[PDB]
């Protein structure tokens, strides 16, 4: 926002936002998978308890 011009730097900001959104979505997916695994392990541990 200091080097390039506003109208032509909008595509760069859009691409950065898309990349960060994808990098956060894959992290959310990994967290969901690990949370399901932890839930299964906790159910097994409660059954054993």
């Amino acid at each position: 926002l200091s080097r390039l011009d506003p109208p032509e730097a909008e595509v760069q900001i859009d691409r950065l936002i898309t990349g960060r959104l994808q990098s956060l979505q894959t992290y959310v997916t990994q967290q969901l998978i690990r949370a399901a695994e932890i839930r299964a392990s906790a159910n097994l541990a409660a059954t054993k308890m």
Binding site: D5, P6, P7, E8, E10
Partner: protein
């Protein structure tokens, strides 16, 4: 529909675009970043010279 009119140089018409910089694009006539429409220009040496 809104129509604006002005007279500028030949190569100076390149500054007539959304978000440009220059003596005209910043101090005489600035277009918004989300501008939509058409820009029409032609020679006027037969009348304005």
């Amino acid at each position: 529909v809104y129509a604006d009119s002005f007279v500028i140089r030949g190569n100076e018409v390149s500054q007539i675009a959304p978000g440009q910089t220059g003596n005209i694009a910043d101090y005489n006539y600035k277009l918004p970043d989300d501008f939509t429409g058409c820009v029409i220009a032609w020679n006027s040496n037969k009348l304005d010279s």
